[PDB]
Amino acid sequence: IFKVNSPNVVYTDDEIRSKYVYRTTEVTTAEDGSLIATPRETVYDFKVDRKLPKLGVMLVGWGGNNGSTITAGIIANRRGLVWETRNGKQEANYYGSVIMGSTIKLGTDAKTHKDINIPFHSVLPMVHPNDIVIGGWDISGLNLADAMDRAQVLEPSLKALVRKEMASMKPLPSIYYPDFIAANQEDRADNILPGNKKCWEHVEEIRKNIRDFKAANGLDKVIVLWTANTERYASIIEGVNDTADNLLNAIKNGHEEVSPSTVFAVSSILEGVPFINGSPQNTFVPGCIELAERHGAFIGGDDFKSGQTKMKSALVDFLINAGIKLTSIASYNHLGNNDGKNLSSQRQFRSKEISKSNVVDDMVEANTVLYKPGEHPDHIVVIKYVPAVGDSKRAMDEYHGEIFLGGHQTISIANVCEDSLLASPLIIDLVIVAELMTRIQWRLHKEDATEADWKYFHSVLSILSYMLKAPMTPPGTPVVNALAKQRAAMANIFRACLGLDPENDMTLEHKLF
Amino acid sequence: IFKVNSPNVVYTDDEIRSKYVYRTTEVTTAEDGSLIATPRETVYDFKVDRKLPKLGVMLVGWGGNNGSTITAGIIANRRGLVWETRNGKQEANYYGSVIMGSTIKLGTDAKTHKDINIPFHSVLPMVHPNDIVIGGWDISGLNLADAMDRAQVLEPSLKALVRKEMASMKPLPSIYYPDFIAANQEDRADNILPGNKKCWEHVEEIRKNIRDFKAANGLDKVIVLWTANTERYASIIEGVNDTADNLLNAIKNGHEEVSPSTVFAVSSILEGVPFINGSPQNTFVPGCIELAERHGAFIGGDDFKSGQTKMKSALVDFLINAGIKLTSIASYNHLGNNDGKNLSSQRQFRSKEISKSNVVDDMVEANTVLYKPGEHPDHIVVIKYVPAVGDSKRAMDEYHGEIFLGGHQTISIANVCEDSLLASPLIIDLVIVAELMTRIQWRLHKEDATEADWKYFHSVLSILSYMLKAPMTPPGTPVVNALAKQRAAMANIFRACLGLDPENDMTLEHKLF
Amino acid sequence: IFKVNSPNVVYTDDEIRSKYVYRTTEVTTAEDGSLIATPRETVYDFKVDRKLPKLGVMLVGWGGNNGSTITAGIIANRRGLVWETRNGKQEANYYGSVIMGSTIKLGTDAKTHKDINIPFHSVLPMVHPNDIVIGGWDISGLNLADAMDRAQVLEPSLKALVRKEMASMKPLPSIYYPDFIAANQEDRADNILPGNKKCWEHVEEIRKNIRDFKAANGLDKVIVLWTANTERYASIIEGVNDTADNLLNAIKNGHEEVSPSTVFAVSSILEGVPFINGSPQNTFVPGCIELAERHGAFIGGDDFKSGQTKMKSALVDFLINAGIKLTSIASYNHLGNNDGKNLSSQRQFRSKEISKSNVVDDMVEANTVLYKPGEHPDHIVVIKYVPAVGDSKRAMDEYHGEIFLGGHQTISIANVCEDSLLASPLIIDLVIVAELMTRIQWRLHKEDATEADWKYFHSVLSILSYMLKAPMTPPGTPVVNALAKQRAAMANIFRACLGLDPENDMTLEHKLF
Ligand SMILES: NC(=O)c1ccc[n+]([C@@H]2O[C@H](COP(=O)([O-])OP(=O)(O)OC[C@H]3O[C@@H](n4cnc5c(N)ncnc54)[C@H](O)[C@@H]3O)[C@@H](O)[C@H]2O)c1
Ligand SMILES: NC(=O)c1ccc[n+]([C@@H]2O[C@H](COP(=O)([O-])OP(=O)(O)OC[C@H]3O[C@@H](n4cnc5c(N)ncnc54)[C@H](O)[C@@H]3O)[C@@H](O)[C@H]2O)c1
Ligand SMILES: NC(=O)c1ccc[n+]([C@@H]2O[C@H](COP(=O)([O-])OP(=O)(O)OC[C@H]3O[C@@H](n4cnc5c(N)ncnc54)[C@H](O)[C@@H]3O)[C@@H](O)[C@H]2O)c1
């Protein structure tokens, strides 16, 4: 633990009221066409609620690969289970999680002159993942022990320990619209609500399920996470999905271009729970976003940045920030789970391909020294279904680049990654950060500020962009896709609630003496 | 171009006098063992000399692979030469250079709400690489056109254009101490000064050469860069190399444990020119550093971070900052130039292995959540001599990591990199940044400050750490090895001389509205 | 099953007496320097003993990685055990074995015109691996269940089934000469016979152990296989190891340059059991071979061709037989078992490096169109100890080649191979083929041949060369290292005992009609 010694930071047993000075640079164009840089300061008052709630996560796709892996891993970490591998004994951990497995720099030691590093989870009052309750919906009624055996992700020794408690968990019936997921997912749907079309009864039932989850479990806050199959893009039609009331009427009129995910998101917005989409499909259409802003409900980005895309975000940033001109990026993946079986259809593969292909455009528009306006590298993404490899995704990347005097650099990467074991800690990170963001309020520093001036963060949580492949940002704002930039954004926003200045890495006390 | 509109920044035609507030966090231990974080502010006055000098670089190892590549590339960029490749026409560029091929963010647009990115070279008044004069010493008297043909790095079409002017360049005689480089480099030395041992006449001759370079060329500033063969570690002996006067006496007494690089560095310190070591050997012993601090001469780090080590700095940082526990790093390189031939000896390979192996220790000591005190991954580095591959170094990396619930991640990387084409822009970056650092002065902001209170940066230039594999820091300070951290340090130090605040990446104007 | 309908093949319930015509080509130099090719025919009589013996294998290094894996796998296949993996249910098999997992072509169908393929194990009367008895010596007294847990090769579910029967197996004490294996293997030796030097009592004890194994178990034939640590090369000294009697005197005189493996081989030759060396060290010195020929004892080659070397034998053959000039071969391996720990010493790594480096010389001497006399590619082999990877050896190969008009081909291979699971079926293959070779006799076809003219194959079994990295051939004969050639040799020699002609692959009945 640590505390901040500053007149600007006031600690109360319920609140961490703090004063912060946001310092930025504003650029305006001069008369002769040159740029003028002006330092700007905005004084902000931040309020952080110290009380930790009893948090529940509702998973849409509970019986999937990722959902079963999560519920098993939370049980394993909560009980401190030790199991047997060929190498010997294995203990439960939260590796692969930036919040639960990484540290950030607090400051420099006065005496030793060395850096003080504290866990990322300990910066702000945050909910511990061991106490997270899981539930939700699935079109397949298989219990989560049998779902665990279907997934083929976990070792038999661990499954033996977690099977007794995971056999009592059965997902609630969900909604199946046949048009949106692949034709080979017909035989999977046995636990489905009455109706293959879009209706207002589905919204009522989903709201009832969220209510009953919170009531029966005894939870203070609920979060809904979409971990279901990738869907096809729902066409944007004027009068159907372009406005909150238009969409609310389209649900009742039973229009044939409303995704199941949109029904879940609408139910979440009407019940006041945050909704995070873990799939590349366009769950939030114009009208879902406006309904979220009209009600004050928090909504997150799309997809999960776990594996080849995370390393791509690191590498493209590193290579373009070093002066190497990337001309080709070729991503090849083949996998043999139900995720790859659903993406074997073109209409459902297109969404994932679009999500994977749009991670490098911001980095190539930032480097105007290498890339001319309109110059983009050849970015190809291929995903194939190989049933024999199972959950072990094999990714092959070829990065082709141009260097000094026309030289050629080629970087070939072979990644053997367990998909579910790389996305589960991301879900933990998403829920923990979203719960924290529901507990932070802000206002402008005035000499007569009242309690009525407290405001929340914008309904679209871009602070989750570290864990999201296709970040969703507030309407009209740019998108940040660099991994280091997103991690720094999260860390510095967390430090701003403590009145601490952002990390600059200059270290002038070691250079000027 | 751009200008800063701020009362703290005053622009004169010769100076950029600016006022900056260095904001950091200081950590002190409380009585009950907890940590206390206190915001600290140090007010600094920075003075930047706007006048650009005529800069000359003296290369020790001019006829090597890297030196010939540099002199050819500077000619190619200066003349704007276009040559023929199989793919068609190729123009000269400075790709692979962070200063000449990358951009940094200046600020946000007032109207568009989009980011303004300006070239890294345009942030501060900096010397253009097209105007850099080259010269120096080599033990081989071959002219640099024949040295270019010996190197086997450049295409015949480019060599045809640059051969006429590169055949008039002949390196000055150098000093050859047989004990320090490999036994297979005996036949290479034909241009050597009289003497196989350490003497004060060598210092006189090297100082004379630096003087004559500056006088004949008409230069305002000179920088010496060691681009010669990797040397063996010179033993630290009390009374020989532990003190500036002890070392100055050891040169005259002709002790047998003084490297040729130490003679070059001593000559540079006595003539007031900066010296940058581009090799893993310990050029600066205790006594060379003290002589540098006693005279005010600037000295740089060791080795060149070009290729597998740069990507290692990116990847290890990315993986450990994401919660993945690296257990094994295995670097394999084989190459067939004179660099690999000199490293075929164990005593000269040890220095490069030590330099390559110490890039990840700071990242594993920062993450106390994953690594216990004393826990280090298995880091192996292998370098082999394969004459058939030439300058094209083939690097194979295996990163083995532990992830959620005991999962295994393996990342296999095959890099085919032209060594000389990845290190030449690094040399340009080093000389440009070092020249700029010779033009920056600092002081503490007082109400009665005088002109006599202006001070330079510390003699050990750690701001070059981005381009250096084994960064040398001021005595008693920690070492930063993360690539993103070093680039951010350079950018934020450059912005501090303009009175601008460091980049925080928070973007609160897009989240709070 | 199948039978041969031919007057040349006579089937008896105990013998398969057959007549074969060995057809080859002989080359003699003409007067004008040209070559003359003459067809030669040698008529051979082959006798194959149909009776299958009760076979026992004695392993030197029983408690090692490979020995424990073998004894466990034989139990698993014998009992037909099914265990649990993450993917589901796994049954026992003999995959990775050329005899037990591959087929050979018997002939063409008269009616269908399609090929008839029969299992390699069914060509000749051969011992089934399910009935093989295991035993032997080890310097470590740990039982083989605890040795199995030490090895970290097998899944916990399989180990649970095999642990009860593998805990009753304890290796006999062995002989430890400290000079020959690495200094870090001191603490491993607790089950050692009295004596750190070479003595005749060791031969008596080893012979007693072989006798008692056969007597107690009730076996008809015994084979000894060296699966112990790699040793250093024993110097060839005149009067010590250059003659059978010289070596027999050197054992008694206690010379300090006689390997432990030589003592085992000598004991085997004096007891009449075959000895196969599975390590790169020179077990058979001049004098051991002569003793083998003087007694009639069978001795095999050196090392195990399992993994990167097998693929190297395939690839180098394929590339050089296709017209591609290999200029560089770079093999990198790192592993973390006791094998890699013993090879961390230079004197013990040299033997493995020599064994791995000499697999391509025969292929480059066969292609006189590409390689001039004395032209050899750059062949580098690196083996490193990385304790974190365990038995999973990571091999990285770079094959660099020259193609049409000076083009460059590069082939980069990343192999993740379980070392013990690739060498265990090789040991099964070696013992099965060696037992068969002890049951085959030959003679020249004469009109008055008697029973006294029956002869055995030469004491040095080169027919095992498929499974051996460093093939040992009869003194004065060339070595075959191509994998396809060795497999074809084995198949055609097996078919020659059946009176069948070698496979030619011409298929003229489908081309001439
Ligand atoms: N590395 C990763 O695992 C990763 C990374 C990025 C994105 N994603 C995305 O996350 C999602 C989950 O991946 P997975 O491998 O766990 O999936 P999966 O293939 O196991 O299927 C998800 C589950 O959702 C269920 N489902 C489908 N439609 C439903 C509906 N309308 N209501 C309720 N349940 C429904 C399916 O029956 C299935 O059990 C996918 O969309 C995938 O594309 C995964
Ligand atoms: N990617 C890279 O190229 C890279 C990266 C990191 C470090 N380095 C280091 O940079 C240096 C230059 O590499 P290179 O491939 O150009 O080297 P190289 O093999 O071509 O040899 C450098 C030159 O220095 C000369 N030399 C040696 N001792 C000398 C002395 N006392 N005085 C004058 N000249 C002397 C040699 O004759 C040779 O011509 C090496 O030490 C190398 O280890 C290179
Ligand atoms: N893929 C492979 O596994 C492979 C391939 C080629 C060659 N080999 C060779 O096969 C051998 C076995 O490999 P491993 O990984 O099973 O070995 P290992 O590292 O497990 O050690 C072999 C065993 O032999 C024992 N031993 C050593 N000296 C002995 C002696 N004098 N008498 C009795 N026991 C003795 C050791 O204590 C150890 O238990 C090694 O020499 C290895 O180099 C293995």
Author numbering:
A (entry chain A), B (entry chain A), C (entry chain A): 40 to 552
What did the study's authors say about this model?
Myo-inositol-1-phosphate synthase (MIPS) controls inositol availability, a second messenger in signaling. In the first step of the reaction, glucose-6-phosphate (G6P) is converted to myo-inositol-1-phosphate (IMP) by myo-inositol-1-phosphate synthase (MIPS) and subsequently dephosphorylated. The fungal MIPS from the thermophile, as its mesophilic counterparts, forms a homotetramer, with dimensions of 120 Å by 100 Å, highlighting that the overall stoichiometry is conserved. Overall, the higher-order organization of fungal MIPS is in line with previously determined orthologous structures, featuring an extensive β-sheet network at a horizontal dimerization interface, a highly conserved NAD+ binding domain and an extensive vertical central domain connecting the monomers.
We utilized a minimal purification approach to capture the endogenous MIPS, preserving elements of cellular organization, and rendering the sample suitable for structural characterization. Extensive image analysis was performed, utilizing reference-based motion correction, resulting in a final reconstruction at 2.48 Å (FSC = 0.143). In the final reconstruction of the endogenous complex, we were able to resolve residues 40 to 552, which overall reveal a high conservation among all structurally determined MIPS orthologues. Residues 380 to 400, guarding the entry to the active site appeared to be in a folded state, showing clear α-helical morphology. The endogenous structure of the fungal MIPS displays a fully populated active site, allowing for the unambiguous placement of the cofactor NAD. In the asymmetric reconstruction of the complex, we observed persistent densities for NAD, illustrating that NAD occupies all four active sites simultaneously—i.e., MIPS is endogenously NAD saturated. To evaluate NAD dissociation, we analyzed PDB-deposited structures of eukaryotic and prokaryotic MIPS and could not establish any link between NAD binding and active site conformation changes, supporting our hypothesis that NAD is tightly bound within the active site and does not dissociate during reaction cycles in the active endogenous purification. This hypothesis is also substantiated by the observation that NAD does not dissociate during biochemical treatment of the cell extract and is present in our reconstructions with full occupancy. State 1 (S1) is characterized by a folded helical domain (23%), whereas this domain is absent in state 2 (S2) (69%), possibly due to unfolding, and backfolded in state 3 (8%).
